[PDB]
Structure 1
Amino acid sequence: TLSAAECTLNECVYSSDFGGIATVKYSASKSGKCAVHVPSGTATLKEAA
C-alpha cells in the first residue's frame, strides 16, 4: 500500500515516443509491484508495472 507519494516532471517533451519522465517520491508499506496506470488519456505509460 502506497503512502506519501509526490510526482515531479523533471523532463517532458511532447514527442511521438515516450518523451517524458516522471519521478515519484514514495513511502510504501512494503516492497512489491504496482500496476502503474493513468486512467485519463492525458499520458500513455511505457511501463504497466
Structure 2
Amino acid sequence: LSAAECTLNECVYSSDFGGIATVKYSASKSGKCAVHVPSGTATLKEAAV
C-alpha cells in the first residue's frame, strides 16, 4: 500500500465483533493479503481482505 488512512465507523466495546473500521487505502497491486493487530488492543474478525 501507500497512503492508507483508517477511520472508525462503529465503535462499541461489546463481547462480539462490535466495531467497524474502514481503511481507505491506495494499492500498487490489486491482490489479497493479511491484516493483523500486534497488540491485545483489538481482535480482528477476518484474517485477510
TM-score (norm 1): 0.92
Q: What is the aligned length?
A: 48
4+ aligned runs moved over 4 Å, structure 1: none
CA-based RMSD: 0.6
Cα deviation, 1:1-49, whole Å, max 9, x if unaligned, reads x111000001110000000000011000011112100011100000100
**Unaligned 5+ runs, structure 1:** none
**Alignment identity in percent?**
100
